[PDB]
Symmetry: none
Subunit: 106 residues, 2 copies
């Protein structure tokens, strides 16, 4: 079951999971993008530093909700709202970041 | 029900609700205009708090751990949601700092 587009990245920003709703939103299949860097894949070049700064704070233990402009496979610009969360593993340590897209645009 | 404090962009208190009076043990009248970080953040943690507490931009919300100290000097390990307050021209004019009743791990995502 999937409520929304969701992507998981490790602490460097490389993709570790990419759900079916993400396949539809961004127009890549999971196999095409596994291991690729999310910010390089979909964030427009002038916005990468800002996106990376957010991800760095999230990986250190904060939750973020905000405007997230990204580039679909077909080169449409998406003005999304995303919820970014640290992901905890079984050992209760931060292992990555969740990037989930909300149903309203900014 | 939710403790909420508003600050201006100097870090000084502009709003303090009844729930904040109960959480932190101060009344609105005595804290209005006071610097929030000097009021409730332990000395060792202030630069850290300042480093982030003023950094919220337009169209984002930050949720994170926030160590504070009550009037009685009990240490509180809290979580706060920080959002910008916009003026009539949609410029940031302040920051809203509202307490969540959870520790951070209860808000995080999980791998199984």
């Amino acid at each position: 079951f999937e409520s929304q587009p969701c992507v998981s990245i490790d602490l460097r920003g490389n993709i570790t999971s990419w759900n079916r709703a993400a396949e539809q939103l961004y127009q890549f299949k999971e196999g095409e993008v596994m291991g690729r860097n999310l910010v390089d894949l979909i964030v427009p070049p002038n916005a990468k530093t800002a996106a990376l700064d957010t991800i760095m704070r999230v990986g250190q233990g904060e939750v973020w909700i905000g405007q997230f402009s990204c580039v679909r496979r077909d080169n449409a610009i998406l003005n999304t709202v995303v919820t970014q969360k640290p992901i905890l593993d079984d050992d209760q340590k931060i292992s990555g970041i969740s990037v989930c897209t909300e149903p309203y645009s900014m």
